[PDB]
Amino acid sequence: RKMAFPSGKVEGCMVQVTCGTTTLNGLWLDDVVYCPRHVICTSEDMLNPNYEDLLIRKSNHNFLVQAGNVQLRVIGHSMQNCVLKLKVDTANPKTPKYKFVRIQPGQTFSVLACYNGSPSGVYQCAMRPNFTIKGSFLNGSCGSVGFNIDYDCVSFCYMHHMELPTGVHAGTDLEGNFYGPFVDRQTAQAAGTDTTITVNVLAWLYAAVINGDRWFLNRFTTTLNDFNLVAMKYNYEPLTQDHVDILGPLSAQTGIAVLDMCASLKELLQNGMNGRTILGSALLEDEFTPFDVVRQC
Amino acid sequence: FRKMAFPSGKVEGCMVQVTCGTTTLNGLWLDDVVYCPRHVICTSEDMLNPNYEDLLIRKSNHNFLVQAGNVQLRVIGHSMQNCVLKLKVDTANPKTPKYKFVRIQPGQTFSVLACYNGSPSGVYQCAMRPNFTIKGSFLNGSCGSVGFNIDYDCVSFCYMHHMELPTGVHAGTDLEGNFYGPFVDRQTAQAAGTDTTITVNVLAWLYAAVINGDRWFLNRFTTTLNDFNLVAMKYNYEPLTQDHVDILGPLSAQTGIAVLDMCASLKELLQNGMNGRTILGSALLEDEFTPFDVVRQC
Ligand SMILES: *[C@H](O)[C@H](C[C@@H]1CC=NC1=O)NC(=O)[C@H](CC(C)C)NC(=O)OCc1ccccc1F
């Protein structure tokens, strides 16, 4: 089962941010609220916004920040890349221990989808190799954040800014730097060609085994380089030696050598599933990391 | 589409741990009552067929250890409601949300906050199968984890976890302690009925495909509900109820496609197969999204 981190620590930080006729979500940590800077745009602005220009023309009192029924007074504002930072006069007592991180493609994270400052749903995503994320984000979701929880610490890794015409999504880290070649303007943008996260497919196959599913296994083996040749042919990421290392615990747990699973994946790529499913799916799933699988088994 | 859970924070604020001896499971702390599975009072010698009523008479308030984190909550009364233990505690939970206890129907979905020793580990979306099992992720120590939906500010609690079956699926009760399905809280091998496909959710999925402009499978014909139900059962699909017909109303309205017309389209897919075609990027029909789930993500 695809499993998200419990979202309570993040729900206590979500607020609503309005400028003009534009409302989206912000993240309130300590006495600062972080949100996408395109909240300051209007219809005409959005096509080619000169954000520094638009921002200097704004006053602190142009920002309406609401935490539920309560309006927070903005006592200062600044911009860090694509993220607007609003200083408010009061600190959030619900602020958890946190940090800002930039995740690598193939890493997963939970998304708390929010609208008008209110949490609506939580789900698990992966950072695609082409730096998109396949999410459920509608109008008004901008400022929703993605995160992981290690111990009692929330690592914020994603803030949501836009949809692409293919229906995937793009956004920034909490320093305001986009993942991928995207820009926060109202244009149709295309991503690089997406590739499949191989180490995650391998983790998922080990999971199907742990759960007693093994029809796809074979007795064949393969070298790492010969597997990577076939992987790349089918637009799968090559498997690094650290990726192999990371798969050790699942290998140990099932007694299936990593390169043996690679030989099984190779057969699937070349032949398909021929009606058969794995863990219920007709497709090879690649949004489960080794850690995600282990933690759940 | 994707499975999307409700935000879990209102439920996290209610999770505690309940311990008898060395046996620790999770409980749900609402106002001044903690709810947990009664088998917290079982020993290993008792697991195969406990006498819960006799096991409880031997129990006093001061034998129950209830903790929120490392903070003890003193128990001041206890009772048993079916398969659930109710422990009155001396502190009202300040984080109690608006809530209700609901008993859901097969096919309905809900979020599960998987907890261990009172600490949440993850949240995910489950479907109650037509045979009253759920396909969860539960390890040892997960009992007492709850399933819920959130409507506005109000948490509807619908599931409490009690056990695993040989097939690897899971079974449990509502918050009044009544099992879903024919199962009992004893350490015995129990078999669920044969699982069937959740027809109402497949229909919801077809509506979702139509809303997104994927509508090759729509035909010019209709059927009666009885005719559809009789065919459906031959393909191991659940028959539709009047409540199923009714909760498809909004999607029927959104699309202008009568429920019974969508049933005729489904019938043709069941009889003729997909013919190497996809619906929403899939050769498989999905049955774990309810009409409400579809509306949420659309
Ligand atoms: C903020 O809430 C919003 C979220 C997206 C709206 C619908 N699904 C979403 O994920 N963000 C925006 O609307 C973006 C604002 C820009 C100034 C960055 N724009 C956007 O998502 O639309 C992209 C676009 C533009 C033109 C043609 C196609 C297309 F996809």
Curated annotation (Swiss-Prot), chain B:
Modes of activity regulation:
Inhibited by pyridone-containing alpha-ketoamides compounds 13a and 13b. In turn, alpha-ketoamide 13b (tert-butyl (1-((S)-1-(((S)-4-(benzylamino)-3,4-dioxo-1-((S)-2-oxopyrrolidin-3-yl)butan-2-yl)amino)-3-cyclopropyl-1-oxopropan-2-yl)-2-oxo-1,2-dihydropyridin-3-yl)carbamate) inhibits SARS-CoV-2 replication in human lung cells. Inhibited ex vivo by michael acceptor inhibitor N3. Inhibited ex vivo by compound 11a and 11b.
What result follows from mutating K88R?
In strain: Beta/B.1.351
Q: In which compartments does the protein localize?
A: Host cytoplasm; Host Golgi apparatus; Host nucleus
Outcome of swapping P130H:
In strain: Omicron/BA.1, Omicron/BA.2, Omicron/BA.2.12.1, Omicron/BA.2.75, Omicron/BA.4, Omicron/BA.5, Omicron/BQ.1.1, Omicron/XBB.1.5, Omicron/EG.5.1
Catalytic site residues?
Answer: H39, C143
Q: Which residues form the Peptidase C30 domain?
A: 1-298
Q: Where is this cross-link: Glycyl lysine isopeptide (Lys-Gly) (interchain with G-Cter in ubiquitin)?
A: K3, K88
Where does the record locate the signal sequence feature? none
Give residue ranges on the Cytoplasmic side.
1-298
Reaction it catalyzes? TSAVLQ-|-SGFRK-NH2 and SGVTFQ-|-GKFKK the two peptides corresponding to the two self-cleavage sites of the SARS 3C-like proteinase are the two most reactive peptide substrates. The enzyme exhibits a strong preference for substrates containing Gln at P1 position and Leu at P2 position
Q: What is the effect of changing Q187A?
A: Does not affect ability to cleave and inactivate human TRMT1
Resulting phenotype, N140A: Does not affect ability to cleave and inactivate human TRMT1
Query: Its biological function?
Result: Cleaves the C-terminus of replicase polyprotein at 11 sites. Recognizes substrates containing the core sequence [ILMVF]-Q-|-[SGACN]. Cleaves and inactivates human TRMT1, preventing tRNA guanine(26)-dimethylation of tRNAs. May cleave human NLRP1 in lung epithelial cells, thereby activating the NLRP1 inflammasome pathway. May cleave human GSDMD, triggering alternative GSDME-mediated epithelial cell death upon activation of the NLRP1 inflammasome, which may enhance the release interleukins 1B, 6, 16 and 18. Also able to bind an ADP-ribose-1''-phosphate (ADRP).
> Oligomeric state and partners?
3CL-PRO exists as monomer and homodimer. Only the homodimer shows catalytic activity. Interacts with host FBXO22; this interaction promotes the proteasomal degradation of nsp5.
Q: What is this protein called?
A: 3C-like proteinase nsp5
Identify the species of origin.
Severe acute respiratory syndrome coronavirus 2
Q: Gene name, please?
A: rep
Tell me the part of the parent protein that is shown.
3266 to 3563 of 7096
